[PDB]
Ligand binder design. Structure first.
Ligand SMILES: Nc1ncnc2c1ncn2[C@@H]1O[C@H](COP(=O)(O)CP(=O)(O)OP(=O)(O)O)[C@@H](O)[C@H]1O
Lengths: 49, 56
DNA sequence: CTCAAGTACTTTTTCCGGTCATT
RNA sequence: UCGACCAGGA
DNA sequence: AAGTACTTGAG
């Protein structure tokens, strides 16, 4: 069915940026611990909390 | 306080040495020893002490 | 022996890859 | 497996 | 930057 409204439609230069989800997504439920503090480590890189 | 903090205890005579869990040794293989900063300073106090005692 | 000015000290939002030296 | 700089995200 | 917390110094 025709949309009641008419849409502003056309080409537009769009950019792909370097922030892709699967490079951010992280979950840690117990893992590596810091030596000194005995607390979780830092960053997804180190699989921290 | 007569029991917990006498004025005389503000001056140090006997130094308490914290154990390794406080000042951990950073081992970066077998041969690569690596000690903490607090371990170096205590060794330096102990170095400085040994000199003062020998002079006396 | 009062009070103006110089002296020093201690803070400064929250979470979230690379490269260097050296441990 | 240690922490400093730099560059970034909302 | 703006308090504090003192010395330092003039009248
Ligand atoms: N330096 C910072 N510190 C803390 N929070 C920040 C921040 N920068 C951004 N944010 C968070 O992000 C929120 C708004 O920033 P943005 O989302 O990047 C703007 P926007 O909402 O996308 O569009 P707008 O510019 O039309 O408002 C803030 O309310 C805050 O919660």
């Amino acid at each position: 069915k025709k949309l009641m409204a008419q849409i502003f439609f056309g080409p537009t230069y769009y950019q792909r940026l370097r922030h892709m989800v699967d490079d951010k997504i992280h979950a840690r439920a117990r893992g590596p611990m810091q030596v000194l503090t005995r607390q979780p480590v830092e960053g997804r890189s180190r699989d921290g909390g | 306080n007569e029991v917990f903090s006498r004025p005389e205890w503000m001056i140090l005579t006997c130094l308490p040495v914290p154990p390794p869990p406080v000042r951990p040794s950073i081992s970066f293989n077998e041969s690569q020893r690596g000690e903490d900063d607090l371990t170096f300073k205590l060794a330096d106090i102990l170095k400085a002490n040994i000199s003062l005692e020998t002079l006396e």
